[PDB]
């Protein structure tokens with residue numbers, strides 16, 4: 001079984017290396033958390049376009065359940081979220097988790113990898129999410145696919161990737177990732193199904209990891225059974 | 236990686252030990268293969284009940300494609316076999332492979348494991364193929380499931396089993412098995428998909444091995460593409 005530990009201040013989980021150069025070489029988590037809460041406040045009070053996007057975001061179907069989800073993920077090692085295409089699972093849930101950590105002064109304690117079924121999706125979704133936070137990829141949002149990657153920043157960040165990348169990484173280790181999200185599970189894929197076996201081993205060794213599986217269809221019982229009749233949350 | 240070698244005259248792949256029972260325990264392959272070709276040829280002449288059954292087999296849709304399938308498998312590490320259910324994939328293909336080896340003085344060079352998606356199919360199929368061969372289970376055919384098994388003879392034989400039984404075997408290795416057949420791949424299943432990954436690793440280290448994937452008429456592209464754009468035999 002592979003090695004894992006929670007996020008640390010002077011560890012970059014995306015480049016899997018100590019941080020030795022730069023401000024964060026010595027910054028404290030409280031400092032990092034406080035810093036990033038303030039940078040959200042500022043980006044709002046300067047980018048006028050951003051307030052309209054957040055407004056378009058409040059309107060999506062999944063927003064009703066922001067609390068049910070955070071709570072369920074926070075209390076359970078594995079959680080299934082399911083619901084029809086168009087609710088906002090893909091583009092919003094990662095953000096709900098991130099923002100929940102930023103607002104409650106916990107931004108240092110959060111990094112999220114999210115898998116997608118295809119190269120296109122890993123990239124377009126990373127762009128989209130960066131766009132919804134008024135950024136370009138590279139800051140709070142990155143991606144990594146075969147041959148091409150714009151890694152996000154070291155802290156309080158989300159990296160989208162193909163399953164291939166994430167499997168290749170699970171060899172070295174996923175030190176410092178707090179959340180792994182497998183999106184579009186309903187789409188049959190071999191490596192993805194294999195990824196679930198590895199992730200299931202990881203959870204057994206490391207209860208404090210958070211796994212979220214996300215389906216567009218009702219056929220979730222196969223996965224629910226595989227992860228010890230874990231919670232299903234409707235959206 | 237998993238250990239593997241071709242079948243050897245002294246080795247029983249099913250009990251994973253040296254052969255200490257039956258005829259020609261210590262003989263050469265050339266000798267074992269003659270014996271078995273003779274034993275089959277004779278059985279045909281004497282069992283008139285078996286001759287009715289062979290005519291019944293002759294009419295199955297899959298019969299037509301016998302040569303095409305054998306040629307495809309002999310020339311490729313992996314093959315996929317696709318066809319309407321009822322067609323004869325499950326009950327015949329293993330026999331076509333066995334009988335090709337027996338008939339061309341190679342009986343000793345053939346041992347076939349076949350996975351099924353349910354314990355009951357493993358057994359029911361094993362028992363049916365034994366019947367289409369005028370035998371009880373335990374000679375050219377057997378099975379192995381969690382808690383019960385009737386193992387077949389060590390040479391020129393087929394064992395049916397569950398995906399789990401095989402995954403456990405692959406931990407210790409599958410030395411002496413010439414063909415691995417995964418049946419009913421269209422039935423999505425996590426462990427079955429895990430198996431395919433592992434089998435892909437085997438094929439890379441051991442191109443001499445044969446993998447045969449069997450499917451109802453669905454979109455097999457995903458499999459074809461996982462196994463290096465391998466053939467697809469339409470049936």
Ligand SMILES: Nc1ncnc2c1ncn2[C@@H]1O[C@H](COP(=O)(O)OP(=O)(O)O)[C@@H](O)[C@H]1O
Nearest residue numbers: 060083084085086087088089090091092124128
């Ligand atoms: N790249 C995009 N461009 C414009 N609108 C988008 C884009 N991605 C998502 N959206 C909007 O946000 C909605 C949510 O999609 P998504 O987050 O993928 O939800 P789900 O995962 O539940 O299908 C879409 O229905 C669409 O209206």
Ligand SMILES: Nc1ncnc2c1ncn2[C@@H]1O[C@H](COP(=O)(O)OP(=O)(O)O)[C@@H](O)[C@H]1O
Nearest residue numbers: 295318319320321322323324325326327359363
């Ligand atoms: N246990 C059995 N008893 C009698 N006939 C059988 C039995 N199993 C299979 N058959 C016959 O052989 C045919 C093919 O079975 P099978 O090899 O499972 O086809 P496939 O795998 O292509 O769906 C069936 O349509 C049936 O007529």
Ligand SMILES: C[As](C)(=O)[O-]
Nearest residue numbers: 282284285369370
């Ligand atoms: C019972 As008989 C003659 O088919 O082996």
Ligand SMILES: [Mn+2]
Nearest residue numbers: 089090183184
């Ligand atoms: Mn989605």
Ligand SMILES: [Mn+2]
Nearest residue numbers: 324325418419
């Ligand atoms: Mn079948």
